[model samples]
Target: INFDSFFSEKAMLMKASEVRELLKLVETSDVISLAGGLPAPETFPVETIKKIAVEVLEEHADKALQYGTTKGFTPLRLALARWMEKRYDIPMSKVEIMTVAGSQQALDLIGRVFLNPGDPIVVEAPTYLAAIQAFKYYDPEFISIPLDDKGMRVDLLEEKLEELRKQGKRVKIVYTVSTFQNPAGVTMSVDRRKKLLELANEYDFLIVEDGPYSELRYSGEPTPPIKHFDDYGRVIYLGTFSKILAPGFRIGWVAAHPHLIRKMEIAKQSIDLCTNTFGQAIAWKYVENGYLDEHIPKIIEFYKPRRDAMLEALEEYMPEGVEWTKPEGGMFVRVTLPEGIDTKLMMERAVAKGVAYVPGEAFFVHRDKKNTMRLNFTYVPEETIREGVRRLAETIKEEMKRV
Candidate 1:
């Protein structure tokens, strides 16, 4: 409370949110949280990870115990390159790679490198929240784009890009979750992906393709990343082990132009110096032994029913004027209630009634839509999902009457 004396200028600019404080209360109270963006805990391959951890220590302690390259553990980076090629149908010989602590670190590094103060950058209407935080700290002007079921409206983006160009502004980057977008549960269609890349080329901006939930498809066809369509190394693809393997491992990677990868590697040196050596080593073996390929379908199987439960319950319980996304894959469903109801104002009441959800406003750069909320189905099981949705729907029904 008394930080005026020693707080740095950057630290002074940081803020605390009333909504975040309310979210804290959810932890103490007995509430079923459909709020958090989390992977299923049960899907963590603990037994296999345990075996790999010991094997890594016993077989490769000299390197694992020692500090690793800032670029990352060599074997892990090599393994990641191979996995990307096999899974995404990418030609890896040209693309460069670097391991990050998590995708968050990579995001911060991206903001640090790409964003100049007051530079224009584009983001989706309801983009990944942490990415907004990451980019905000760098002081870039946010050009917020809107999304539909197929994902970001490229037509609207073209309009905005043209408007900015008319004003003599060029966007530095366009960040997209691309597949299974956070808070919205939408994926960019193939045409939109291609259009985005074309716009990036036409307007001369970089495309940041985020891929945390790419491998978690419970249904629907898998789409190759926007990076897969990239030419001239314009798309920066971020992949993570957190969603698939385990978050605690804290290992992720960036694939980009060799130049950008080198810059990020240097920028990384001042931060943590290197990602988790032991974790990367274990991750290398995890893929090498085909555990990653083997475990993905299992994770999908574990999550499919929970996603179904959330959808079915929403249909059964939610009153009229309540509509939600029916995602074929990923952990979340985005629910938009009637326009008059603000989800942040409704959250405390939801918590009191034993269900909690993330107010969707926080995910937006402008925080325009207060009527929406993001429901995550990955953390809780099917029965809890039904009960939580029932209570949430009941609360909304009551709130709608007030309006």
Candidate 2:
């Protein structure tokens, strides 16, 4: 009898995401790393967290350390509900919110609750890779809708929906990252948001509005989340503190209908009884004291110089025909190599030259993206961003010579 055969079918079936595999090699060099979509550790509200921890432990030592409800600590939930109401203007009843380990778990729970094998789920062509990996366990087929500077092509969504209908397939959910999407760093326009809500209403499908980056915007006017306009009960909202706060804390939540929340609750119990009790307390204290609101802006301010530096270096050193996105305020920016260029080869050469970045192909759900790569500017300093881009540009120029 083979022990490997005892593994769950889905575990054996799903391939480890290429991005995670690629990232393992990032530490091989002391080279400037523009590969990780991680917040700068310096940006964390350490002093505030320390204060909160002491207060929480002093006041609620027994409760903070003990196993809590599967629904999460009540104070944290109530505080989050009020925060959402003020921040996004969404009226939240306590029944609609449930704290999970992180947004990643929320995606997994969503798949468990809503998807069956071979159900079609719609996503942007370059959606968050982790969500793709989570949904894969449920065995749902993904339909990748191409995104542009404005985000998911609203015009083409209906056509795809019609195409699916023709084939006797019904979409289980249309997942979108409305603000500062990963890999692409594109934000959806207000008009597109309205159009998407309209389409969801028409198609009678659920919309998962994953909004981890919404609060990190530093440069431009903000657009309201799709949940802001959702009156038809067609939108499911997921948000995370990972961008602004430390992801090590592992706290995030989903806002949905009471029925969906009940389903997610069961899934949550099966996954891990509940999120870390003390971590939830720390998060609750940080938000309640306005630490997140004050500290996130500083993180944005720090990244601005780094982003500008990388953009300038790309402009100065990149060869002709190469292109990249100028993101407003996000951890990542994407560079597209010439059509003939292979990003996999680019990464291999880049590592040899003592520089690193994630190949863009790793971000796609269905197939590889040969001409693209993503650079994260938030983790490194401004000077490093310049140097890293210069090294990458040199690598690209060398690759161009062969083409």
Candidate 3:
């Protein structure tokens, strides 16, 4: 009855994560929850998936239903390996693909394979909450860089690299949410990306580019991924079907050098043996059949307006000194209230007003940015997003008066 005393240090490190706690609050309440970074449920290819689910079972029930290699389904791996060569410019000879339960596992495995306790890692300030949790298990020292509209300050990264080198320090890896970053919704510019790789080469660190939202762009010209510019296989790329296909299937993949992939493969065997094969079987067919290509624009079309509605609502209601990121695409928008207006302290009053959102401190590893919050545009309906922003603005004003 008291297994808590037997928990490992890593297990102890994972306190009820912010995403877990915020989601729990949403479930038991009736509020316009702009709290969870959930895809619009209607965006899923329901009929198409139902069609493929049956086709996959009929054609490959034995393989789909049974345990498979930790390297994952070859049919899917080969398809993905080829796609990465074209999509991310990772050379086919240098790369391999492995399927994991979710991109969360992709992040976790990278941490497991690479980190040693007290090794230094660079992360964007106010980065993805789960990534911080994933890497926190290894007990690495965090060196965070603040973001401007252009995303992470690469120049500052260079300065930090010089500082560390002068101090006889060596960093193990640098992780990024990269494209349409979670919470902030800021896309790192192409120039900054190239400079990041330049720094990686100069400073001696691996780059874990976690990009689940790269395919969700609704506006602007497409930019090449950071992996595209990688020459030495220093960048490990993570991809997921959670956004484009469906999250329910819990499928995601990683493309990394055979060196890293080899260790990840071994680590994955201990983690899950293999990802759900049934999900892999269906996702493989979904891509090979071109249904995934046919479905993305529809997803883009559906989410673009919701993003616009949120931007418009923020512009209309948020008071002076209040600011929020202008994201071209993605599920979230980061809202910055005036200094000392801690969003964590304001959540109860806002939820009571029928709008629920994640305080921005939830995304920061140290829970550092008390004046900010992240709102999920894709989950709340457009009209409801507008109402939620209005109520949030009301809450912000009330908190401003008190704080």
Candidate 4:
């Protein structure tokens, strides 16, 4: 605790993430965590990944083990570019993609390239928690735009953009999660996607689309990313192999204009020098062999029942005033408690009862929503999903009495 002499000003600004710190509490008892947005450990392709690792080391030992370009491994970039084109029908050159350690690194690189002290950046009111952490360190003035079930409000964005312009403010970038969004579990409609792009084009500010949950769809039609509509080179698309392949591999890529990627490559060199060469080679082989497409459908199949179970249980167990999102396809569900119930206090009581869920306050960039929390169906088993919901409902009921 006495590191005052050993750290810099920037190091002093950072603290352990709330989720990371709370994970250690798993050792206490029979804890069903809806806190971390993690894939089930049983769902990892361990056997397949092990086989691919051996094959990669045998076939390309020298290349995989050696230093590589900061832009990333060549074959991996090619595989990613092709995969993007095939999935989204968006044409991409290898030059447009820069593989990073993970999408978190992609976000940090975005800050490195675009943000300076006091630079204004726009984020959804209740945005991804990690992104708030990443952008906050850069000392940018966070401008939170309100959101609804449909996703980010473009009309409000237009008004904000006009207001900022009139005040001689430069709106640096706008960040969003268009498909199966984090925390909220809300998917933007196709029409909103187009309107968002139109506003970005009209205002001439870049849109950073962070989409690590797109293919995790358990039901409904696949929603096209906001980046899919970008014809004017204004959107920076961040995707990851973590959700699909494995998070430990630490492989993800950014798709943007070549000019922008060049800057990111420079930034990457200054940070870690290059990404994991061995991991990238194995991932490239996986995609080239067509295992990813086959594997993803299996993931969706596994998560669907759990999602359904949680929804049904919440409907049965929750009190009348409580409301939760019924998402078509996503790992998480958002629940809003009755008036006067604080999610933070409710979380403490829930943990005491062998269940865990993230308080919604952590997700907001500015003002905290005291009555909400997020639940993840991906980490807990299908059977436990029901019990977790029941226990969580009891916690809310107990909290209501206190109110």
Report backbone clashes per prediction: 0, 1, 0, 0
- In candidate 1, where is summed lDDT lowest over 10 consecutive residues? 19-28
Best candidate per TM-score, number? 1
CA RMSD per model (angstroms): 1.3, 1.8, 1.7, 1.9
Model 4 C-alpha lDDT versus the unseen true structure: 0.85
TM-score of each predicted structure versus truth: 0.98, 0.96, 0.96, 0.95
Model 4 misses residue 249 by how many Å?
A: 0.4
| Candidate 1 residue pairs in clash (backbone atoms < 3 Å) | none
Q: What is the Å distance of residue 385 in model 3 from its true position?
A: 0.7
lDDT of 3 by residue, 235-347 (tens): 88899999999999988998888889999999989988999999999988888778888998999999999999999999999888899999888898888989888888788
State the displacement of the C-alpha of residue 313, model 1, in Å, after optimal TM-score superposition.
Answer: 0.4
lDDT of 4 at 73: 91
lDDT of 4 by residue, 1-403 (tens): 7878899999987778765656755445887777778878777888889989999999899999899899999898888888888898774542288899999999998998999999999998678888988888898988887777787877788888999999999788999987777888888788888988888777778989998987887877778888777876788999999889999999999999998999989998989989999999999888888888889888888888888999999999998889988877767888998868888766667889888888888888764678888899888787888988898888888888895
Model 2 segments more than 4 A misplaced:
15-21, 91-95
**What TM-score would you give candidate 4 relative to the actual structure?**
0.95
User: Mind sharing the TM-score for model 1?
Assistant: 0.98
Better of 1 and 3 by lDDT: 1
Model 3 regions lying over 4 Å from their true place: 1-5, 17-28, 88-90
Number of the predicted model whose lDDT against the real structure is largest: 1
